[PDB]
Ligand binder design. Sequence first.
Ligand SMILES: [Zn+2]
Ligand SMILES: [Zn+2]
Ligand SMILES: [Zn+2]
Ligand SMILES: [Zn+2]
Ligand SMILES: [Zn+2]
Ligand SMILES: [Zn+2]
Ligand SMILES: [Zn+2]
Ligand SMILES: [Zn+2]
Ligand SMILES: [Zn+2]
Ligand SMILES: [Zn+2]
Ligand SMILES: [Zn+2]
Ligand SMILES: [Zn+2]
Ligand SMILES: [Zn+2]
Ligand SMILES: [Zn+2]
Lengths: 88, 83, 441, 450, 43, 41, 90, 90
Amino acid sequence: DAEIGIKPKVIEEYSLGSGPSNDSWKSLMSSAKDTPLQYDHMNRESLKKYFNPNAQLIEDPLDKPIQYRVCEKCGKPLALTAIVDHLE
Amino acid sequence: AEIKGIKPKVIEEYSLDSWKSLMSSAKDTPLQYDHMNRESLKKYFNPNAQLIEDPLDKPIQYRVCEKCGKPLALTAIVDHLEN
Amino acid sequence: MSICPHIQQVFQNEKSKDGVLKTCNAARYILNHSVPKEKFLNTMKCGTCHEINSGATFMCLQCGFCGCWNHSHFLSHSKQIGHIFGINSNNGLLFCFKCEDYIGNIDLINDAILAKYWDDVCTKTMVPSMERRDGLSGLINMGNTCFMSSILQCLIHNPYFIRHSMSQIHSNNCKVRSPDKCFSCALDKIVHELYGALNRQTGFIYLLTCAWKINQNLAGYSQQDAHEFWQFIINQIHQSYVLDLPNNKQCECIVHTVFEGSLESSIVCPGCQNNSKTTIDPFLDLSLDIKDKKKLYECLDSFHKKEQLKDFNYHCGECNSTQDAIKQLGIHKLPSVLVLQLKRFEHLLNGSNRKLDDFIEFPTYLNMKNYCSTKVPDIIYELIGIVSHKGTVNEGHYIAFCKISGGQWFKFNDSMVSSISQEEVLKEQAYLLFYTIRQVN
Amino acid sequence: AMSICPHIQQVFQNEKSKDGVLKTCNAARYILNHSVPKEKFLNTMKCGTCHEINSGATFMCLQCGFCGCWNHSHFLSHSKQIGHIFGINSNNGLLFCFKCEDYIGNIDLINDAILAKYWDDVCTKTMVPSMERRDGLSGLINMGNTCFMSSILQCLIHNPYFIRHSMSQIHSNNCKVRSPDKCFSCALDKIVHELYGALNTNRQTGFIYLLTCAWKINQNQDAHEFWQFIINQIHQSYVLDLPNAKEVSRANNKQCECIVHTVFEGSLESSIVCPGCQNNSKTTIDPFLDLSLDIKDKKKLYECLDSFHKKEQLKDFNYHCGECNSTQDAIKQLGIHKLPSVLVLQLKRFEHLLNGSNRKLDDFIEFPTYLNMKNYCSTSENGKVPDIIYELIGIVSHKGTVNEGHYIAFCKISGGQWFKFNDSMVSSISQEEVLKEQAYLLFYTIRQVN
Amino acid sequence: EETITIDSISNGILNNLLTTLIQDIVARETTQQQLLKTRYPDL
Amino acid sequence: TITIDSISNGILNNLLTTLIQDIVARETTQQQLLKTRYPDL
Amino acid sequence: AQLKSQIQQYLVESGNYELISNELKARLLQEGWVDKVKDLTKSEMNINESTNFTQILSTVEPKALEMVSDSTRETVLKQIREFLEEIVDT
Amino acid sequence: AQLKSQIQQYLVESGNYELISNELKARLLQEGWVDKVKDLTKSEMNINESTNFTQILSTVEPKALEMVSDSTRETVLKQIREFLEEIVDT
Ligand SMILES: [Zn+2]
Ligand SMILES: [Zn+2]
Ligand SMILES: [Zn+2]
Ligand SMILES: [Zn+2]
Ligand SMILES: [Zn+2]
Ligand SMILES: [Zn+2]
Ligand SMILES: [Zn+2]
Ligand SMILES: [Zn+2]
Ligand SMILES: [Zn+2]
Ligand SMILES: [Zn+2]
Ligand SMILES: [Zn+2]
Ligand SMILES: [Zn+2]
Ligand SMILES: [Zn+2]
Ligand SMILES: [Zn+2]
């Protein structure tokens, strides 16, 4: 129904970035290092309000099958993060 | 048919008292059973056979340790206590 | 009953007590060690009449005389000389001829071979119990398993648990290192069997043996409850974390970082809405009354509700005014995996057990936002497992269902595994429901 | 068979190039997991070319920092304009090949790139999940129903020879393990203690420790098999706590003084005669701890015993007699040479057939309360066999089919009272009624021998 | 007593064995009951 | 040329197509891993 | 007269007293007699509130003699008959 | 044109893009849509004997857009328009 420019007051409150296209994603490495674990559809401040603070969280756990490998000597199922210790 | 007496010729097998004077031979007889004949046992049973004559005649005779709670056979009782 | 006074008498003199015992044994020994012919001729031949087996034949206790019964010849011998005690040579039993009866109820006489040690025996051992004397007792059947097994399937298909097991924590820490001794090592074995390679599912059996030894109520057909086993099992995992630690509170173990929530009960000022008192109660599952309900969210509702208290008139600091405090319950803290029990069992103190049959509608995605305290975004859990009971309370079995990765449901009916649609899994009358946190806005 | 991106394989022939791809894969996944929503939307879901957010998936270039959309094909253009053909979906970390027009989802080292530094070990010392176990789908094997043990155990603990033996503390006196969960006989002894003695709270610990000891010893239906199992364990434990190595053999090969062997063992005489000439070679004397009787077409136990001690025929071809050269069929008879103090008869009721098939014979067989065995013993001259009479003290019965199927014990106690033991239910029962049961095991104790 | 025929002593010897036997059987049942009844007042 | 209704639909379309393309990528890759890892199924 | 004891002596001393005795017990056992006499004794203790031997025996011995089956009596008496033809004379 | 991105930059930085986006995933999940799309994908993989993303996408994507409910569509659009009208001029 309507037609549309963008409100001049709101432009001044943010808009023209942009930085170079070829550095875009690499650019985040530095602050990612300072940033704690984030989930796509688990909001950080709601996890803090409504869940225990040392709660375990696997996002979308049934999305893909379990990621494991089986030891050749003992035949144990090992989580990827446990394999290297198991082996030494 | 009325009994006229013993055949004299039978009193020819013959040749001849307090119960307490049986301990002489008793102490040297091995365990006998009232109605399991020792020759048939020797013959049709094994030489090491265990036997309990009339085993359902009366209940198992035993006593129970005050401390253990273990049920003890009468001939077992004193060794349990002693050591 | 009473005892032979004549023998009781003689037993007051303790040299003549040892006398009749010595004689009882001597006799019996002879009886047990005499050839039939010598037995017949010297223990069954009557002294007065000279007949063998004129009935019972009795060896006198005082002389060497032997008397038959049928011609009252031991009765005569006891008349005078006066010797009133005889041992029947068929059986060793002691007869009193004034009592006209057998002395059968004197333990010392029955058990004469322990004569020498009798006082240590009287005081350090007792006669058998009335109800144990014949060894009668039932022995229970241990094929009652499905209340333990359906739970295990839920745990074996729960992703927080698999991650824990397959990450080797317990195995790196356990001091016992044996599936027959340690409960946790038994679970690791089940995981090793189901998911890994061998080097027969003994995992469940080891786990049973561990279980029944730790708590024998877990055995037999005593109608045990799948829920009780849930609590039992998660408790064991916690107990194992606490034992492997070197040396108010909130625990870092798997059970306590995955399944624990907390309820909040508080007194709120109906004026300024600030909470005046707040008590917080941890939980590992929630139990939901289902009488007359028809949908899971109607059960959760009655759970989190406001109550006008009629006996709490108080002063609000914040207001500041006099208020009749409202009470409200609501979740303070949600678990990573939420476990719900629909209450279907009344095991009454009036013995008989009833199961509620009611179908309750449950969703594949469950939004817990309304049941939370203090404006609350969507908190959505994904249904990953169900434990169900069918049919009758005492002849029934528990069945587990589990969503695996990619969305297939399976039905576990020990030990038949089978595929199953979701449209059907939803038709079950759920007893336990397992939900795992999927979306938090 | 399913194929792998040739371009990415092409890149991985080179070692450095390979390592570099995996560093970039970890870094992009790292960033996606350590980035606040607003910084995720602006720097990994914003097309470098059209500046839109979420014009479909946005891909993070594997070789520069460019991000490009799918819907207007801006990564495709990027790939064509500068030859950078690989990118990562910023919603999921999945690597895409814009020449294959598809994702590289089937390479373990890329999927599992967090282990890049140790791949040599990982892929040599661990294997992928087998297809059958990958989802953990398996039924759980319980112990089975346990009445085939219950029911034998009730008979054993109402057996006067065994009770006497248990109550004499002989095992207790000699055992070296001295605990129920580890030693089987200790567990048997505990059952006795709970049943006859005292506590100092269900009388069930013995039984549970025993079930457990049984399965530890033997990983795994048949009451009779469990009878044989128990008795071997009892013998095995006499041999174990014996002073020697010379005595282990004499006891295990010639003569044993264990409770089992001195109460349940008899000897069969198997005579093979020539029917022409009468050559009695060869005849053997073999022990037995029970007798298994056939019951097809029989209505009475004496008929069963008769059949078992009847003269057969051996058709074993390529045979001729020693002394007389007759190829004629050899006569075999079975006969009792030594009787046991306790005779355990088994009525063969379970035919195991081929494949998985089976059959239960439900035939009623009359059994007497007093059984006389004179007619079934071997030696014109008066060595005519005297009465040798046993008394029935225990029956085990089976109801149902062979597969599923329930067991019940009957036991006579002192004073000649019978009890029916149906797992936990113990009830009294008349002789009349016990004598109507379908016996499977009969337990006879020696009563009179003339 | 009765005139000592061959059928007379024969009956007398059988009689002796039966009665001795009956009395043995009765002795063992009375003594057992008497021990149980005094040992366990409330059977 | 360009309405509120219209550019509202562009934004929704972007969100949907993004979400669809993510679901599909996880499914296709997943099945592709199963077929490579296990020839028979 | 009064030699009946002396017959008994020779029976025992020859071994036939045993034969007789045992053939009887074996027959009585197998006939179920032994058990009926035990159960009868229980019936009598119970209906007479008593465990007095002499008194119960009064009530039991006569019914227990009546019970012995006629084949056991005949057979066993026939056996005794014969061992006397051996040592007693016409 | 080329102010679509300008307005999307706004939403992202005001936090209302998170909101729109999250409310949408939230609706779609609860109405079963995510699951329907996953299954549609698996079915097209079967029907076409392929796991190639581009090919499968092309048959799934139009049917997945046809599949969102009226409610979700009307409600979310409404919500978007609302946040728009606070920052544009007509
Ligand atoms: Zn290993
Ligand atoms: Zn003790
Ligand atoms: Zn005297
Ligand atoms: Zn006399
Ligand atoms: Zn007296
Ligand atoms: Zn452990
Ligand atoms: Zn804990
Ligand atoms: Zn207030
Ligand atoms: Zn673009
Ligand atoms: Zn590039
Ligand atoms: Zn390629
Ligand atoms: Zn032991
Ligand atoms: Zn042995
Ligand atoms: Zn020949």
